[PDB]
Amino acid sequence: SLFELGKMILQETGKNPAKSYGAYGCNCGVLGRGQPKDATDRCCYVHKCCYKKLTGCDPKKDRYSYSWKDKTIVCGENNPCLKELCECDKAVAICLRENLGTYNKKYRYHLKPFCKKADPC
Amino acid sequence: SLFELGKMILQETGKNPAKSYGAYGCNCGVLGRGQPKDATDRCCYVHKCCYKKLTGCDPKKDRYSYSWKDKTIVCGENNPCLKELCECDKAVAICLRENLGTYNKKYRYHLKPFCKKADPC
Numbered sequence: 469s470l471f472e473l474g475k476m477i478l479q480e481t482g483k484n485p486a487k488s489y490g491a492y493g494c495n496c497g498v499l500g501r502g503q504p505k506d507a508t509d510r511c512c513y514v515h516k517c518c519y520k521k522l523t524g525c526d527p528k529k530d531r532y533s534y535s536w537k538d539k540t541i542v543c544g545e546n547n548p549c550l551k552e553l554c555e556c557d558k559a560v561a562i563c564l565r566e567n568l569g570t571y572n573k574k575y576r577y578h579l580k581p582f583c584k585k586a587d588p589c
Numbered sequence: 590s591l592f593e594l595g596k597m598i599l600q601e602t603g604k605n606p607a608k609s610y611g612a613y614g615c616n617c618g619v620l621g622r623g624q625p626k627d628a629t630d631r632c633c634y635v636h637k638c639c640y641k642k643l644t645g646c647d648p649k650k651d652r653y654s655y656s657w658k659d660k661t662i663v664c665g666e667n668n669p670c671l672k673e674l675c676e677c678d679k680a681v682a683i684c685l686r687e688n689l690g691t692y693n694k695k696y697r698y699h700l701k702p703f704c705k706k707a708d709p710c
């Protein structure tokens with residue numbers, strides 16, 4: 469769900485997930501996808517493209533189990549969809565941390581309706 | 590559009606609109622409505638209910654003209670829909686400023702998918 473997604477992003481980046489990534493760019497947080505704005509945004513593009521196959525689970529609401537073991541996100545889920553969902557969230561969390569170097573605060577509270585359409589997944 | 594709306598909220602409250610009201614509560618900013626969580630959220634519940642009386646104007650994208658005169662938002666505006674929309678945005682801006690006294694930061698980046706459903710407008 470959004471709870472696990474948020475903890476993962478916090479754990480990886482060390483930043484408040486809802487505040488930095490809840491409305492970042494044309495892809496991250498609320499809503500769907502659009503043309504990415506930078507690498508941080510492109511992380512979430514893939515993240516949502518990754519969500520697309522889970523038809524599945526509710527990526528926002530369905531909870532799942534995972535562990536923070538030696539500063540590594542370990543998905544511990546039986547249930548195919550939830551396991552895939554957890555791996556989606558793990559990936560984006562990692563990607564977000566790797567691209568902290570180009571995090572732009574000007575995209576933090578982006579107005580998404582004015583985003584250009586995204587390429588299909 | 591979101592630009593005039595955000596400017597209004599800034600002018601009345603003195604606060605960053607996207608940051609304070611972009612994802613506040615179950616009703617402020619992105620998405621639809623849910624059960625209000627305080628007075629400030631309820632100011633956006635009304636705001637979104639007000640959008641539903643419009644006649645084909647786009648509340649998120651359509652620009653309109655307004656003036657900041659004697660510290661009052663004065664909707665100019667030709668085009669009747671745009672004017673009602675301007676009045677809708679003006680209302681919530683004032684309402685948001687009037688209810689700054691009970692603004693709760695813990696609702697700032699609220700997780701809206703877990704909000705309980707709103708009544709019909």
Ligand SMILES: O=C(O)CCc1ccccc1
Binds near residue numbers: 694
């Ligand atoms: O963005 C923050 O970290 C806190 C911001 C804030 C600014 C003004 C009043 C309350 C909170």
